[PDB]
Amino acid sequence: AKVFSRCELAKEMHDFGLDGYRGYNLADWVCLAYYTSGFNTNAVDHEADGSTNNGIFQISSRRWCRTLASNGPNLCRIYCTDLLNNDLKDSIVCAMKIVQEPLGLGYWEAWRHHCQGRDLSDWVDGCDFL
Prior knowledge:
Blueprint: H1 6-15, H2 26-37, E1 44-46, E2 52-54, E3 59-60, H3 89-99, H4 109-114
Helix pairs in contact: 1-2
PDB class: cell adhesion, sugar binding protein
Keywords: cell adhesion, sugar binding protein
Assembly: monomeric
């Protein structure tokens, strides 16, 4: 239902206060979204164990959100399908809870494999709102 451009997404995330949150800057978050969902707020990925990864940050039904038949701790206290909204707020809130765990953004494979260990300033370069 919505695919953000890079700077549009950066602007929304800046509005949500993610620049510097838990020591990660805006670029970290933009890079994460790109490599998890390609900036698609409606993305769903179905893993081999049948769990789902959901929304802009590809949040997992095994731990963080609730689906039926795949019961779990549902730590964000939210149906998975509610993380598929055009409005980012619930995905943001849930990602914030995830990054409070010891790994931070290292919890995402996509971030470890494409964003960590790299200069990411490119991801926010040229952005009008800044």
